[PDB]
Design a protein around this motif. Structure first.
Motif, PDB file in Angstrom:
ATOM      1  N   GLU A 128      -1.619   0.646  -4.936  1.00 17.24           N
ATOM      2  CA  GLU A 128      -1.475  -0.657  -4.264  1.00 17.24           C
ATOM      3  C   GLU A 128      -2.666  -1.575  -4.502  1.00 17.24           C
ATOM      4  O   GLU A 128      -3.799  -1.169  -4.297  1.00 17.24           O
ATOM      5  N   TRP A 129      -2.391  -2.817  -4.893  1.00 16.29           N
ATOM      6  CA  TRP A 129      -3.438  -3.835  -5.063  1.00 16.29           C
ATOM      7  C   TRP A 129      -3.888  -4.373  -3.723  1.00 16.29           C
ATOM      8  O   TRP A 129      -3.065  -4.616  -2.843  1.00 16.29           O
ATOM      9  N   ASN A 130      -5.196  -4.582  -3.591  1.00 17.29           N
ATOM     10  CA  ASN A 130      -5.751  -5.380  -2.502  1.00 17.29           C
ATOM     11  C   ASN A 130      -5.266  -6.829  -2.647  1.00 17.29           C
ATOM     12  O   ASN A 130      -4.865  -7.241  -3.741  1.00 17.29           O
ATOM     13  N   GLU A 131      -5.279  -7.586  -1.551  1.00 15.99           N
ATOM     14  CA  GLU A 131      -4.941  -9.023  -1.583  1.00 15.99           C
ATOM     15  C   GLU A 131      -5.807  -9.810  -2.568  1.00 15.99           C
ATOM     16  O   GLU A 131      -5.367 -10.815  -3.108  1.00 15.99           O
ATOM     17  N   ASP A 132      -7.044  -9.359  -2.777  1.00 17.31           N
ATOM     18  CA  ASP A 132      -7.997 -10.060  -3.643  1.00 17.31           C
ATOM     19  C   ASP A 132      -7.726  -9.895  -5.144  1.00 17.31           C
ATOM     20  O   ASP A 132      -8.472 -10.434  -5.959  1.00 17.31           O
ATOM     21  N   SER A 133      -6.677  -9.152  -5.506  1.00 16.14           N
ATOM     22  CA  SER A 133      -6.305  -8.952  -6.912  1.00 16.14           C
ATOM     23  C   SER A 133      -7.450  -8.315  -7.715  1.00 16.14           C
ATOM     24  O   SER A 133      -7.541  -8.484  -8.933  1.00 16.14           O
ATOM     25  N   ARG A 134      -8.302  -7.570  -7.014  1.00 19.62           N
ATOM     26  CA  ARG A 134      -9.551  -7.053  -7.560  1.00 19.62           C
ATOM     27  C   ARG A 134      -9.635  -5.551  -7.288  1.00 19.62           C
ATOM     28  O   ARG A 134      -9.807  -4.754  -8.209  1.00 19.62           O
ATOM     29  N   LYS A 135      -9.493  -5.173  -6.020  1.00 22.05           N
ATOM     30  CA  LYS A 135      -9.497  -3.770  -5.626  1.00 22.05           C
ATOM     31  C   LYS A 135      -8.098  -3.148  -5.664  1.00 22.05           C
ATOM     32  O   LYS A 135      -7.110  -3.766  -5.262  1.00 22.05           O
ATOM     33  N   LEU A 136      -8.040  -1.920  -6.172  1.00 17.77           N
ATOM     34  CA  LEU A 136      -6.828  -1.117  -6.223  1.00 17.77           C
ATOM     35  C   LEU A 136      -7.012   0.114  -5.349  1.00 17.77           C
ATOM     36  O   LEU A 136      -8.026   0.775  -5.445  1.00 17.77           O
ATOM     37  N   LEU A 137      -6.019   0.438  -4.525  1.00 14.55           N
ATOM     38  CA  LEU A 137      -6.038   1.684  -3.753  1.00 14.55           C
ATOM     39  C   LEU A 137      -5.136   2.695  -4.445  1.00 14.55           C
ATOM     40  O   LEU A 137      -3.947   2.425  -4.670  1.00 14.55           O
ATOM     41  N   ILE A 138      -5.709   3.844  -4.793  1.00 12.57           N
ATOM     42  CA  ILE A 138      -4.950   4.951  -5.377  1.00 12.57           C
ATOM     43  C   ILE A 138      -4.997   6.134  -4.416  1.00 12.57           C
ATOM     44  O   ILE A 138      -6.069   6.523  -3.963  1.00 12.57           O
ATOM     45  N   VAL A 139      -3.839   6.703  -4.096  1.00 14.47           N
ATOM     46  CA  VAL A 139      -3.800   7.915  -3.277  1.00 14.47           C
ATOM     47  C   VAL A 139      -3.105   9.037  -4.039  1.00 14.47           C
ATOM     48  O   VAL A 139      -2.035   8.838  -4.619  1.00 14.47           O
ATOM     49  N   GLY A 140      -3.716  10.217  -4.035  1.00 12.12           N
ATOM     50  CA  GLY A 140      -3.224  11.318  -4.847  1.00 12.12           C
ATOM     51  C   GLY A 140      -4.008  12.590  -4.649  1.00 12.12           C
ATOM     52  O   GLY A 140      -4.728  12.739  -3.667  1.00 12.12           O
ATOM     53  N   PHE A 141      -3.873  13.506  -5.602  1.00  9.35           N
ATOM     54  CA  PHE A 141      -4.440  14.844  -5.482  1.00  9.35           C
ATOM     55  C   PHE A 141      -5.040  15.257  -6.815  1.00  9.35           C
ATOM     56  O   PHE A 141      -4.376  15.169  -7.847  1.00  9.35           O
ATOM     57  N   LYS A 142      -6.294  15.705  -6.780  1.00  3.98           N
ATOM     58  CA  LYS A 142      -7.061  15.992  -8.002  1.00  3.98           C
ATOM     59  C   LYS A 142      -6.467  17.135  -8.820  1.00  3.98           C
ATOM     60  O   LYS A 142      -6.474  18.284  -8.390  1.00  3.98           O
ATOM     61  N   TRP A 168      -3.621  -0.803   2.334  1.00  2.00           N
ATOM     62  CA  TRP A 168      -4.597  -1.876   2.536  1.00  2.00           C
ATOM     63  C   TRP A 168      -4.260  -2.659   3.808  1.00  2.00           C
ATOM     64  O   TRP A 168      -3.081  -2.968   4.068  1.00  2.00           O
ATOM     65  N   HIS A 169      -5.297  -2.967   4.586  1.00  2.00           N
ATOM     66  CA  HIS A 169      -5.226  -3.939   5.678  1.00  2.00           C
ATOM     67  C   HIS A 169      -6.412  -4.883   5.518  1.00  2.00           C
ATOM     68  O   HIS A 169      -7.495  -4.606   6.025  1.00  2.00           O
ATOM     69  N   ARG A 170      -6.201  -5.986   4.803  1.00  2.00           N
ATOM     70  CA  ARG A 170      -7.291  -6.799   4.275  1.00  2.00           C
ATOM     71  C   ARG A 170      -8.232  -5.914   3.442  1.00  2.00           C
ATOM     72  O   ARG A 170      -7.803  -5.355   2.435  1.00  2.00           O
ATOM     73  N   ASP A 171      -9.495  -5.768   3.844  1.00  2.00           N
ATOM     74  CA  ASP A 171     -10.437  -4.912   3.108  1.00  2.00           C
ATOM     75  C   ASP A 171     -10.620  -3.573   3.810  1.00  2.00           C
ATOM     76  O   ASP A 171     -11.456  -2.771   3.417  1.00  2.00           O
ATOM     77  N   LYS A 172      -9.825  -3.324   4.848  1.00  2.00           N
ATOM     78  CA  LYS A 172      -9.813  -2.022   5.505  1.00  2.00           C
ATOM     79  C   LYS A 172      -8.652  -1.213   4.974  1.00  2.00           C
ATOM     80  O   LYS A 172      -7.769  -1.756   4.300  1.00  2.00           O
ATOM     81  N   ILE A 173      -8.672   0.089   5.256  1.00  6.09           N
ATOM     82  CA  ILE A 173      -7.571   0.984   4.906  1.00  6.09           C
ATOM     83  C   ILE A 173      -7.012   1.626   6.173  1.00  6.09           C
ATOM     84  O   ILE A 173      -7.755   2.219   6.961  1.00  6.09           O
ATOM     85  N   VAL A 174      -5.701   1.498   6.370  1.00  9.90           N
ATOM     86  CA  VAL A 174      -5.022   2.172   7.463  1.00  9.90           C
ATOM     87  C   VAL A 174      -4.545   3.517   6.930  1.00  9.90           C
ATOM     88  O   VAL A 174      -3.814   3.569   5.938  1.00  9.90           O
ATOM     89  N   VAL A 175      -4.984   4.594   7.578  1.00 13.98           N
ATOM     90  CA  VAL A 175      -4.753   5.936   7.087  1.00 13.98           C
ATOM     91  C   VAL A 175      -3.908   6.718   8.075  1.00 13.98           C
ATOM     92  O   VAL A 175      -4.258   6.824   9.256  1.00 13.98           O
ATOM     93  N   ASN A 176      -2.795   7.254   7.580  1.00  8.09           N
ATOM     94  CA  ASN A 176      -1.916   8.123   8.356  1.00  8.09           C
ATOM     95  C   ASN A 176      -2.276   9.558   8.041  1.00  8.09           C
ATOM     96  O   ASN A 176      -2.294   9.930   6.872  1.00  8.09           O
ATOM     97  N   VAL A 177      -2.577  10.356   9.064  1.00  6.87           N
ATOM     98  CA  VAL A 177      -2.823  11.793   8.864  1.00  6.87           C
ATOM     99  C   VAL A 177      -1.965  12.617   9.838  1.00  6.87           C
ATOM    100  O   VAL A 177      -1.820  12.243  11.008  1.00  6.87           O
ATOM    101  N   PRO A 178      -1.340  13.713   9.346  1.00  4.17           N
ATOM    102  CA  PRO A 178      -0.538  14.534  10.258  1.00  4.17           C
ATOM    103  C   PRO A 178      -1.345  14.963  11.480  1.00  4.17           C
ATOM    104  O   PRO A 178      -2.545  15.245  11.363  1.00  4.17           O
ATOM    105  N   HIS A 179      -0.701  14.980  12.641  1.00  4.37           N
ATOM    106  CA  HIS A 179      -1.359  15.412  13.857  1.00  4.37           C
ATOM    107  C   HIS A 179      -1.457  16.939  13.864  1.00  4.37           C
ATOM    108  O   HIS A 179      -0.452  17.638  13.735  1.00  4.37           O
ATOM    109  N   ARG A 180      -2.683  17.433  13.999  1.00  2.00           N
ATOM    110  CA  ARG A 180      -2.976  18.858  14.055  1.00  2.00           C
ATOM    111  C   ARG A 180      -2.944  19.275  15.517  1.00  2.00           C
ATOM    112  O   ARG A 180      -3.499  18.580  16.366  1.00  2.00           O
ATOM    113  N   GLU A 181      -2.281  20.387  15.819  1.00  2.00           N
ATOM    114  CA  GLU A 181      -2.244  20.914  17.187  1.00  2.00           C
ATOM    115  C   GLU A 181      -2.332  22.431  17.203  1.00  2.00           C
ATOM    116  O   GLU A 181      -1.833  23.094  16.295  1.00  2.00           O
ATOM    117  N   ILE A 182      -2.945  22.979  18.252  1.00  2.00           N
ATOM    118  CA  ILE A 182      -2.965  24.427  18.458  1.00  2.00           C
ATOM    119  C   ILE A 182      -1.697  24.872  19.201  1.00  2.00           C
ATOM    120  O   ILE A 182      -1.194  25.972  18.970  1.00  2.00           O
TER     121      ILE A 182
END
Lengths: 304, 320
Positions: free
Chosen positions: A95-109, A140-154
């Motif tokens: 996903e491109w940032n609004e600024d057409s400059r920064k790219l967000l890549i999400v994946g696994f090494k 992307w949320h402007r220059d912030k990143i909104v991150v979804n992570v699974p909820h961990r529970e015991i």
């Protein structure tokens, strides 16, 4: 065989999509089309077309055999000097940032990590990197990143829950703890949430909610239908619904109005200046259409 | 800050036994602990297995298999307790466990999970068949990641994701039947997978063949002749489903509730109301966890009539 279209994208008066046809093996190609010209470009062996808001660049994924690697490239639409910018075992989003400059890549090494890379076009390199648990995602949320992570529970759980953070420069704050929706888009102000409301995790349908730091507001609370795909653009939300054999595309601007409603299924859409989508019917494979208030067909690969 | 409560999960039944997991804060050690409870329906007598989840009562009611987490090793262990001889032992170690299922013979045990180095519900997948008589693993095989399996009499029905190289997004499966190291394909690139068997009929879960598929998973029965849908005309999501003596027991998501039904040629309610059914099981009797707006889930049975079996969280108010 026929031409199988995936992943419709649009910015300005450009539209892009993946074309899958079969020689040996099946073949992916990105096609890039100008909407006042209709001439087409070609990136061979490419998938995941993402063009910058300003229309100067396009990022994409290329599958790679032998090394069994997923490659991320970026290219100038004018000069078209492409270059490989990143390698990963798998890529979940691009996903491109609004600024057409920064790219967000999400994946696994406990166990595996989701990697979030931030590529910078000026530096021309990855400039930040962080890791989250597995099944994590981000937008992307402007220059912030909104991150979804699974909820961990015991305590053993029957339903699947999410924690949602907002992230900036190595630091983060928890937005939501153990909720039944997750962030799917943002227009830089309102975050679009997909899923079920808090405490009604046992509800029947996935629906949509907008959050701006004040309250979480449902936009489909009284429609007893489930959402396929949704995007938000300038406070308006564009979304597909499963409706009795059909998948129809709607707009919300305070009122729900139909973009493409009928005996069809909309399988992918994007929206910038003009709404674009893939519509399939019982007799005809999915073709690319546009919508500026009125529907117009842009592709006709499967004529017959 | 809250948690003063007992949290019930994974209800099970065989014969006149019910079992479930009771999870509760140990105020001394300051952490939650999982305990398997085994209750006899005739006299309400209870038995306990500490530090355990995944209770699986053998069809003959003489054994229970379960899972134990080793926090320090980061491994999940499969155990078997002998309810007659009052003894239990670890039989297997693995990184993660996906499923645990007794064969009809109360002797063989199917374990599916992920090997160790060196849909609401409670790089290879490994399948183990463990024999409680021989006291060892007698069969073991690997399938690609996200594969699953169930007993079909003495055979194993194996669901493998149909990867294919035509990139897409509807999920497809190949389904095999496996015995003694050999396998046969039953279904090629189908949008459903096998979730249960009664020894004759195979219950399949997923989305319709052909273009039409979309929002909800559906239930289908394979009888050796055709795959037949049983909820095609019902536009509701399905939760868990089980087949016993050719009758299908299943939960539907309806208008904020999750209700339990039985299908036998027609659909009839078992536990329908303003509540949510959070897992169930069926053998001679039906057992389920039921939660409401005002009450955390408790255990109930159904034999034509509902009876409440537990009242952990309202022990004075509930049982009068």
């Amino acid at each position: 065989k026929f031409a199988y279209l995936s992943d419709p994208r649009t910015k300005g008066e450009l539209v892009a999509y993946v074309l899958t046809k079969a020689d040996n093996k099946y073949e992916n190609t990105i096609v890039i089309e100008n909407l006042k010209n209709n001439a087409r470009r070609f990136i061979e062996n490419a998938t995941m077309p993402r063009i910058s808001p300003d229309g100067k660049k396009i990022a994409f994924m290329r599958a790679n055999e032998e090394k069994k690697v997923s490659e991320i490239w970026v290219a100038d639409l004018e000069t078209l000097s492409s270059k490989k910018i990143l390698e990963a075992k798998n890529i979940r989003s691009l996903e491109w940032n609004e600024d057409s400059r920064k790219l967000l890549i999400v994946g696994f090494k406990d166990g595996e990590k989701t990697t979030f890379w931030i590529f910078d076009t000026e530096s021309e390199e990855v400039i930040e990197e962080f890791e989250k648990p597995r099944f994590s995602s981000g937008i992307w949320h402007r220059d912030k990143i909104v991150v979804n992570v699974p909820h961990r529970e015991i305590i053993p759980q029957y339903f699947k829950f999410w924690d949602i953070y907002i992230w900036e420069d190595g630091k983060e704050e928890k937005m939501f703890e153990k909720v039944s929706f997750y962030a799917v888009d943002s227009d830089g102000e309102r975050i679009l949430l997909y899923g079920k409301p808090e405490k009604k995790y046992m509800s029947e349908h996935n629906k949509l909610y907008i959050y701006d730091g004040k309250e979480v507001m449902g936009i489909l609370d009284e429609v007893d239908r489930g959402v396929g795909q949704a995007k938000i653009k300038d406070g308006k939300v564009y979304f597909t619904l499963f409706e009795e054999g059909s998948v129809n595309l709607y707009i919300w601007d305070g009122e729900i109005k139909p973009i493409a409603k009928g005996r069809h299924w909309i399988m992918g859409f994007d929206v910038d200046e003009i709404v674009v989508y893939l519509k399939e019917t019982a007799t005809r494979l999915r073709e690319l259409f546009t919508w500026d208030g009125e529907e117009k067909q842009l592709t006709d690969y499967n004529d017959p």
